[PDB]
């Protein structure tokens with residue numbers, strides 16, 4: 052059968068791949084660069100924006116924006132460029148044909164899932180979609196049905212107690228220190 | 236309605252599934268008074284009728300569908316009298332040949348009879364396996380379409396010997412200067428690698444062997460090609476009570492003292508964790524040390540060099556020593572092989588690999604994303620599962636390699652124009668305990684009997700088009716809802732492969748998922764009343780209760796690539812790198828590999844035309860040429876014969892050519908009434924005898940009858956014949972009376 056795409060929009064990296072793979076096929080920084088200097092040489096072939104490893108390689112010439120901070124998507128036109136790059140250039144897959152499992156940090160605004168769904172169905176025309184809490188997946192990843200997952204990204208830190216497969220949503224802590232505030 | 240004084244009926248009995256009974260008082264439209272064996276006393280309570288019995292002239296016929304009354308008593312009786320009294324072991328039901336193990340030898344397979352069957356049509360002769368082989372050889376000429384003879388039955392029913400004779404037929408009638416020697420000399424190899432002692436019997440075959448006999452443009456035999464399917468990989472590492480695994484391991488252990496095998500450092504057959512488990516190393520009456528020699532001689536005859544033979548036994552000793560590798564936990568989430576561990580030392584010596592590399596890779600697994608790579612410890616349970624999956628993978632690849640070198644010897648260079656293919660597959664199985672192996676066997680038999688039921692349904696639509704009879708009359712049993720229960724998504728197999736990869740899955744939580752998903756959603760799935768660790772599937776033959784305990788251990792294969800790359804690095808000997816020379820296949824579970832193998836078998840067979848042989852085993856004790864009712868009925872249900880007979884009984888079972896109808900019922904038809912053609916004569920006479928046509932039909936070539944009408948015609952025929960005998964005898968007897976009377980008057 053058609054596999055699902057599995058795509059995780061960290062603040063810092065995109066990890067994407069196909070369901071049933073043991074490790075992600077595409078990992079690249081979720082960063083969008085735009086040129087900030089006069090274009091002197093005629094016929095070089097200008098580009099309005101670089102994404103991911105393209106923007107890393109050129110980064111002396113570019114302003115680098117992160118379009119997610121603190122697990123919130125803060126401008127959509129960039130995030131849509133990042134997904135376009137994920138499906139068409141890194142996975143080389145028609146998004147028409149595969150379910151996409153997206154991912155999100157708990158307790159963040161509800162307008163972020165609404166937009167993140169609207170863009171999958173209107174723009175990419177995905178057949179079917181899902182959105183899953185990050186800290187729940189680390190238990191599937193670690194063979195457990197019980198645990199308290201501490202998960203810390205580039206943008207957000209959260210604890211999610213899970214006992215015997217029931218989450219305890221009153222006990223969920225979210226903490227807003229992460230790798231980017233360590234870097235600053 | 237016929238029941239009278241001097242009628243006969245069959246009655247049930249726990250000792251023999253039916254007793255014959257004499258009806259002792261006429262029926263009145265509520266309880267029946269019956270005479271029996273052993274004197275007479277019964278009154279038998281009808282419920283809101285007894286099965287009714289064919290006249291004795293019919294019983295013993297060559298074809299169970301030629302009976303007038305069709306039911307399980309009649310069938311069991313015909314087979315019992317033909318087997319015990321007439322010593323005939325072959326019988327027909329519909330298209331199906333039915334074969335019963337005489338279980339002592341017979342003359343019947345002689346070349347004279349082979350020649351007597353050649354060219355004959357299947358109804359021209361008494362049934363014999365050569366009649367099926369001959370019909371196959373005919374159909375392959377009449378159409379280029381290839382032909383399959385599907386031999387099926389319980390273990391010990393005689394499927395292998397039936398294939399043997401079926402091939403001997405082709406090789407006698409077609410064959411010329413050889414296939415026969417090589418194919419028959421392959422059997423000890425395939426039996427050694429592929430047969431095991433099961434609970435109910437020794438020498439059960441755990442795979443479907445398919446021999447293609449290839450023919451040229453003139454139907455001379457070219458050569459043969461052997462395929463195998465459905466190998467029971469799980470037996471390599473797990474064994475139930477008083478099972479064994481594949482014979483080869485025990486022939487090897489029993490040969491451990493021989494000087495070639497000293498280096499292999501083998502022990503007795505219960506020293507190793509993969510042969511100890513069954514608690515039964517010795518078969519009664521088999522000397523494994525000599526079956527070894529007949530195997531090596533069969534290899535030598537097929538031209539597997541002694542170098543490769545020692546390679547094969549080196550790899551099998553490898554698997555045996557691998558099984559003794561013991562893992563110590565060092566943490567809940569990590570394990571290690573203890574220092575200087577002897578089984579691993581001997582294994583790495585045998586295979587010629589670095590001890591510390593195998594020691595590392597058995598206990599760790601590796602992941603790489605596109606950029607960078609990680610090495611994980613694994614729990615002791617996952618280490619043991621990985622080692623067992625590696626042993627299963629070695630064994631399966633060794634099996635495919637031996638089959639490939641046998642094919643090298645059996646193939647011949649001439650281009651094969653068409654083939655006849657013969658399939659030796661285990662039958663529908665039911666045991667006091669049923670486990671994942673039985674669940675696979677019964678799923679394969681569901682598929683095979685779907686094919687069978689469709690073929691029979693097609694054949695009778697085409698006969699009705701030869702005879703201009705409506706199709707609506709005929710129907711067939713549809714077992715697609717059970718295939719969908721087992722095979723479809725959210726089926727029993729799909730939830731098993733899911734529970735293999737869900738975290739902390741277990742047989743108990745698997746069973747819970749089954750109940751949640753099917754328990755009252757599907758009519759064919761049932762939970763046993765007093766347990767939560769079992770489930771019941773309503774197969775075509777019977778309801779079977781499967782036990783959830785230890786499905787998941789049997790279900791699981793994942794072969795860690797790094798262990799294959801260690802074995803592929805081997806430099807000591809030729810064979811071990813050669814096995815793995817040509818992914819997702821490494822992830823696939825045993826259940827999924829079985830599903831795929833079964834789809835390959837069905838792709839092979841649906842491209843063909845089948846002819847069926849069903850083998851049944853008369854008695855469990857190996858007594859020569861005696862018959863047990865209670866087993867035989869179980870066999871005949873498991874073979875789908877009883878359903879085929881019931882279905883035919885619903886339609887128009889009995890089909891008489893008009894001229895045979897005349898040859899039977901001339902007594903019924905008046906010397907005046909007979910016409911200048913007997914077809915119209917009988918078309919009238921039967922309308923005289925039975926007022927309503929609905930009992931019968933008139934075809935182009937045959938009269939069709941519903942069940943029972945032939946027995947009626949024989950009844951009225953015999954009563955009229957006795958009235959004629961009364962006339963003639965009365966006249967002659969009265970003459971003698973007159974003669975002596977007038978002599979006394981004289």
Ligand SMILES: Nc1ncnc2c1ncn2[C@@H]1O[C@H](COP(=O)(O)OP(=O)(O)O)[C@@H](O)[C@H]1O
Nearest residue numbers: 336337338339340341390391392393394395396
């Ligand atoms: N038609 C037959 N005539 C004589 N002996 C038979 C016949 N069929 C089976 N046997 C005996 O029964 C044994 C068991 O049957 P076999 O075909 O070997 O097992 P399976 O059918 O399980 O492969 C045979 O080895 C042979 O000794």
Ligand SMILES: [Mg+2]
Nearest residue numbers: 061203204205
């Ligand atoms: Mg993260």
Ligand SMILES: [Mg+2]
Nearest residue numbers: 395438439440
């Ligand atoms: Mg056999």
